[PDB]
Symmetry: D2
Subunit: 498 residues, 4 copies
Amino acid sequence: SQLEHNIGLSIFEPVAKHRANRIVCTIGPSTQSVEALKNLMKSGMSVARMNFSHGSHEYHQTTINNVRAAAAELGLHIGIALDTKGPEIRTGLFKDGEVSFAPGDIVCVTTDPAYEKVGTKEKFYIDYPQLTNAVRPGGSIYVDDGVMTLRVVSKEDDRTLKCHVNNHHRLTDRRGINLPGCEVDLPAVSEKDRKDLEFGVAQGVDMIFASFIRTAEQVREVRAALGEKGKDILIISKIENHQGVQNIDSIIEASNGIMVARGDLGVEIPAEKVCVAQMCIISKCNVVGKPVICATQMLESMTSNPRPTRAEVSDVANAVLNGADCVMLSGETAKGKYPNEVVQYMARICVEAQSATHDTVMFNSIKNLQKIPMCPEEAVCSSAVASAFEVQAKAMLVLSNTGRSARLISKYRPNCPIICVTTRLQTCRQLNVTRSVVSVFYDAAKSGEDKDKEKRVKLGLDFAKKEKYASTGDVVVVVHADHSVKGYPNQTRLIYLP
Amino acid sequence: SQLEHNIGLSIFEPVAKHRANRIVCTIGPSTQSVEALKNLMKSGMSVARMNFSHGSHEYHQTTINNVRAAAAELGLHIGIALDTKGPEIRTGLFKDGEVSFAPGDIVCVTTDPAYEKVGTKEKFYIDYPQLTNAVRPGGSIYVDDGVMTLRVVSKEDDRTLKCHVNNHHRLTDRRGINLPGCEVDLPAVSEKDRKDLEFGVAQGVDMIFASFIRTAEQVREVRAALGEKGKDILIISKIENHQGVQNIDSIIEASNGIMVARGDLGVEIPAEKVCVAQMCIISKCNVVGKPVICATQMLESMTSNPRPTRAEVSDVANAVLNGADCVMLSGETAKGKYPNEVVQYMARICVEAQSATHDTVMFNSIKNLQKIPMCPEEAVCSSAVASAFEVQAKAMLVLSNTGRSARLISKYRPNCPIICVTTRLQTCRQLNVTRSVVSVFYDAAKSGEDKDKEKRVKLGLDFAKKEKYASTGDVVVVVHADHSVKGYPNQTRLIYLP
Amino acid sequence: SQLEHNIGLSIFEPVAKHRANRIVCTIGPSTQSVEALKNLMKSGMSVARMNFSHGSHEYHQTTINNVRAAAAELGLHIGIALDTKGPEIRTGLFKDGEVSFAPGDIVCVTTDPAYEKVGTKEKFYIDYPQLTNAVRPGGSIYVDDGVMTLRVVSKEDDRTLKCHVNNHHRLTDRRGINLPGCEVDLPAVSEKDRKDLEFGVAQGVDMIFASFIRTAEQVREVRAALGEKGKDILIISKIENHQGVQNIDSIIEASNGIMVARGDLGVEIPAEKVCVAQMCIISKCNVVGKPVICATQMLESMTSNPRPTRAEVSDVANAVLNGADCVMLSGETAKGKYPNEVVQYMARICVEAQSATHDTVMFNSIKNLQKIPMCPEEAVCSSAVASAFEVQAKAMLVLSNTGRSARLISKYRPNCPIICVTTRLQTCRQLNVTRSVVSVFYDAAKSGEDKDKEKRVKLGLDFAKKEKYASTGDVVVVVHADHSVKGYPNQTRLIYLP
Amino acid sequence: SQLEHNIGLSIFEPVAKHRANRIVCTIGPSTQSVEALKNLMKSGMSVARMNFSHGSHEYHQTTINNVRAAAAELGLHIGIALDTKGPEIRTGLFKDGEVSFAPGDIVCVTTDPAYEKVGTKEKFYIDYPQLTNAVRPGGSIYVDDGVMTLRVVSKEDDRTLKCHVNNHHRLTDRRGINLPGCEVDLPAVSEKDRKDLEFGVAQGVDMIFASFIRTAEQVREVRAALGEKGKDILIISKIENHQGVQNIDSIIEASNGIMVARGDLGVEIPAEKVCVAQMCIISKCNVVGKPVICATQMLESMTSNPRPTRAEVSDVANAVLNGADCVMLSGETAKGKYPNEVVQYMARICVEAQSATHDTVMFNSIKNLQKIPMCPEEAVCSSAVASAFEVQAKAMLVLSNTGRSARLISKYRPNCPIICVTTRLQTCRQLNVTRSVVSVFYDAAKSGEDKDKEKRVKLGLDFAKKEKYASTGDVVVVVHADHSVKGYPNQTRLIYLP
Ligand SMILES: O=P(O)(O)OC[C@H]1O[C@@](CO)(OP(=O)(O)O)[C@@H](O)[C@@H]1O
Ligand SMILES: O=P(O)(O)OC[C@H]1O[C@@](CO)(OP(=O)(O)O)[C@@H](O)[C@@H]1O
Ligand SMILES: O=C([O-])C(=O)[O-]
Ligand SMILES: O=C([O-])C(=O)[O-]
Ligand SMILES: [K+]
Ligand SMILES: [K+]
Ligand SMILES: [Mg+2]
Ligand SMILES: [Mg+2]
């Protein structure tokens, strides 16, 4: 039982030597140089997130180039994630750049572009043109991560709402706007998003984090936008509002993976419900073997301080115990003072949580929920993990070209590394959002066809030696096809490292 | 499985009506007035904590008096808790009142009290005579709540260690010292704590939060100092370092309760290891059925902000899911801008975690670790909770004078309120640290001795109707003695509300 | 697991001191005298079965009188069961009293009464007048517990079938006939059965074993036949053919209990399927808390030998492990040479099997299958058994007038005796088919009303002492109503024997 | 739960097509002819047992020869088993060849061989010199297979016990003696058994059924007597007394297999305790994955009758449910009237119990008791069975030369056939005592050495199609080595049938 497990825990035991969970870092001014990226990577960044809410194509092009250069210098496969603006709503500017509000303060908000740059305590601009359809008298506008709320007193005209300010707040430029439970219908893929996606395909990004996905239909819109050259890019749907949570099953089925985007989520639904949605979403993803990323304010204080709070440490540990493949940093690495240290903390916490995890509870729970009969490869991969447990394998080794077989082994949550020898660099980069997987590239053009898998296997075992996963005499659980079968693995071997 | 339970959660269903977990709030300049305390109570404070690290008896006398006036106004039983200064190691003073250190600086630290008042960059004093036995070369000394860290390079004589400064810091006079992983030997009760404990006894406080408990002997020393007149006051041992964690079993056995005091604990042991300690301590308390409080930085940012971070919301929920009876607020209510809002959030988060808890999993896990045969009162109590699940009881009712039986029922973690009818105001106040319990006071001097239980039972059932726990024709599970047995409950009845 | 349980078993441990399972003995020429009945009772007979397939009312009247006289002499409540002939089919007589058959031997069978007494190798009588409707050319008649089969070659006339004999057999007088998978529609209650039942009610029999029940409708026919004076008599339906097994759920719902009548069953369906039907039927009865009796050829060889076979011993043990309340003897005690010894064996085997049973596996399995919410009394009774386990109670004590509450405690299969104090002698006799129950009679006319239950409780505890179930200082789990509630028990006490 | 599994059984569904359990038949005058043996084999005999308690080498040579001729005619691999006379204690002779005892008679029994030939009512001889140490006053001596029992009253000298006859019996010359509960010390291999064992080795028998194994030392003595030339013959230790049961762990560890020999065992220990021994022994064998045979009186009555009793049908089914690989027939096929019918019933009952077995419960229970880490071959084998359940494989296929791997797979109790392709006729014959296994012989001398497994694999898959286990496009789970590993299987494949 969880209880009996807990009472046996020790703060005195050694921790896991190889970190299973993966860390996503948002790049910004703190972290864009090749050098800063090298150090993020050294600290434990597996994926680099470009936030296309801000910056031009040139700015992100510099991110892309710098990532590839850092990674090549270090010998790493680092994923690059394009995170879409999507249907964001913001304020315009204000005279000076701040204004200040008190409760009962009556403020007019307008969609008139003419007030964009020149906003005040009585009148300012919001860039959602359908504002006065979206929210009626009595409804509520949430401003700046929902810190200040505005009650709508009346519709003045089609362009203008008169609003009752409900509390004190310090209003900076171009702040976020949220409209919980309103008829907001903006596209999942705007004109702006469409260009950003096209740029992603051109630049060969590995995955999209698609903001504000509320339907499987919207996931497909993002797929269609990425066009023909873009079909192998992962779509991770960001769950961020009421509808996203409601439609989660079918959003999951359409997507390659999911981010719990707790930032917008905890404004869009009451903040205290985010914990329930997180547990629910992470688990649903585990059950179908699709990567899931927990995001936002995980080590937030560390944007300014050299140490995290107690809450932040448990938040990271619990995202891991919840079953998340990945944990994410946003402001902390994009614009914080301690990018490297925050990533290092997150890593150390990950490894604690991983060492606190009961070995086989996930394996069993997940297995018990799968429809029988399985397809052969899933039977191979689950039984492979089972026999890793039974022999205390220090590693597994799987040949995967698309990444499918590596994600399938990971679905069953072994307690050791999954070394994946792949024939595609993009698979190396994409498997970064999958717990436990460590990727090695086999260049089949340079080295030959490897029909019998002996070149790729040897390369995986040599990697196991060099990275100190296992030594001579240790058992490794090796998964690929036999000599005939094409398209999936049908075979498991147990192998002593030579 | 946890996993299956997760996938079946819904964020949309109504949540529990009756909050099970309890909330300790620290009093300070934000919250001390009778007014402020009324609102704290309306907001969900069950226990008021006095931090005797700071302030005179005069100050805390106001807190005591004001709490009692606030509660009497509202008709509530509110626990009062004295949280001791506790032992501490501190540096000496510095020339000119301050000194600045830089990475690489070599500093001697001495227990020669000749140096007490003349600290320099070269050399300063620490007031723990045993220093050079307790920390060996290669060990760390943390200074100023962990902010500066020294590595011990070597021992120069039996009173002097040569050290290496690890980071930039400015020290002033008499900063805190921590000796992570070190067997420290200080009195459990200092001269100051005696006076504080004598005061608490005289003013009739309900519980001690005893700082930095290292051993069971220390709990017994704190009991000894409370004397005959204080023999009924709960000792809640604060676990704040590795020794506390090492000795948890015997400490639990000696105490009435435990606080996982994460502030100091996150300084004394690596921060990532606090989550493992927390899980283990809470579970170990659950197993023996003693209240445990999770503490510190649970909602830190709300000291300044009117909404909590995502990490924070999850910290509170997980403490509840871990199995804590209580969660606690320090800074957030002592000195913060939003004392009420922060308690209200904590209440709402508690309820969400509660509502997301699988009913019976804790009950079974806890019951399966009990040694057979049980005492009869504990069979009666666990079977009472069993029967409450079997009939979906909306409430249970117990008669307890010391509060033992109420704690024994709570131990088995029913999903409904446990109404306790008691003959001691102090029991009402003390039962505030126990999950699910709601106390009603029966005045025996004023209503007769109730040998046959009938009046106390009616009082409880009336209370069930008033407080809207249950109504006419609902089954309530009622626990007390039969007509002849004294000293413990040997009887469970199921009763329909008339 | 069953496996892990088994490997821990010992042939060297002491056995249970109090036998939970109950033994039904068929009375005949070996066993009808008062003296032989005294000895059967001493050996461990709990219920006496009158087989109304044979004997007149006078003969059974002698059984009834002799049972009551034996039991009164010994101070016992012994149940009396009337087992109906029902829709039996038999042969008539033969010249001399045997004839002999060989394979290919062509035999005419007739329903013509005129051939009743005078049958031969070529022509004989079967007492089912619709024979030549029931079975067509190609069908099969099973003769003498299905030892010889006859293939029907043709219908000669409406009275006569020409048959192909399929094997060698030695044919004695008035042998049994079975017609698997034929359109046999005889009444569950014939004219003969109706008189036998009426006689049962007049004579105050405790239960009916109703032969060949194939529908819930038929159970109700037996209920209607017992008329108004007969409504409190248990109907145990004998499952004995295809249709009985098919309709088992609804037969169970209509009945008070079930016998697996393996004799006719294993002719009516292939013999090897009886093991599957037994497991299935016993378990279904366990799940609704209705008594079930395993019957027939359990110690068959002991009809002639002083020791049973190895198969017979395991058959009895496994009926007990299967969950049967009772095991039955037929020929073995009715006409065998070793009535006393066979009953003694059966008892010793019962106690072995009982001691081999895992304590709580039945409790849990049964509890997990019950619809929530339970009614209050079932919550009381299941939790009562749970707390017996938790305190290792050596006994339970329940007040039951109808027997309902005693059968409800038994449903949850405690590992100790259930002492039942009842106000009806008929409840004492009827509870003999319920595992674990030991009955004490409280005469409320002689001793007064006992509203507070103190007279009945005292009588139960005194019985516990005298029968050596528990001594002074031992805990007993006592179940009845509190001082107000009428009609079911709402209360559980744990009591130390004074 | 077993209980839930039961209630869901249906007597009407089709049963398993492929019988998993195996049937040992004893040869005798009923069954010795080549004709009789062909029919036995067609009826379901896998192993022919020779009881060397009776008959010359000449006789058993006919059995051996005839079995081999019968099998060669039918194309079957049939095991031949030599079941030893084993140790025995017997009385001396009596004056006039016989003597009659009555309850209450006092008889001296002496180990003074002066009395060997002059037994009277007053005094007779028992040929066990250690008698007066092995049984103390108050202990029993069983005479004539338990039929007569004596209580030891006292020890008269160091060679004489005064005894009390308990029941009527007639003794003749040299009756059996059993000393229930007594530490008896006889050679494991008598002078007669040597000759018998030498014979068996020379005639190439597949297995010894070694009578009355008390200790592991005895198994080793039997191995020693088999010598170098017999090192490959299975030793199946017969557990026939309390010592066998006491020492089961070490006996199991020394043996290749176990027979629960219930005949003698039911004489040596109370008969009701045989069921406990049986359950424990079968389970303990299952846990280490060695074949166990349940024996004796399983279908006793069918020695004389053409149908079995209800007890008997249940005995066989329960032995299968207990987890026995094999069940056995002695008298029933050696000397009975219905040797074929009895085997056919046993086959049909086996199949019904099999069909009623919960698929995976044995697999999980067995796997959960294995020590971690496993050997790799055992991980491969248990995970292979896992994967067979996951894909509902209709068969598994293993290459095994010694039969180790076939036993290792069977250990995990898959629900389908285990096809074993082996290079040793003797392995085929020996695998007959192992649940589920069906052997096919690959002739390496005649078809080449098959380093790459491809021919043996094809042979097995062809065999799967012919024997109708599976057809085109069904998944079969295939276990052997990869191309380099020798001595054990390290590889599992899932393969569709071409
Ligand atoms: O104060 P605790 O130790 O909880 O004991 C209370 C129990 O003991 C009893 C019996 O002594 O108290 P009471 O005498 O006040 O009625 C039970 O009724 C009651 O449930
Ligand atoms: O005879 P056992 O001990 O079962 O070993 C058989 C196993 O060893 C191997 C490998 O040595 O035999 P083989 O060399 O005959 O091919 C595996 O292929 C086979 O499964
Ligand atoms: O967009 C995000 O990542 C969020 O809102 O957390
Ligand atoms: O009638 C019976 O009892 C039987 O057939 O077993
Ligand atoms: K303090
Ligand atoms: K023998
Ligand atoms: Mg502290
Ligand atoms: Mg024997």
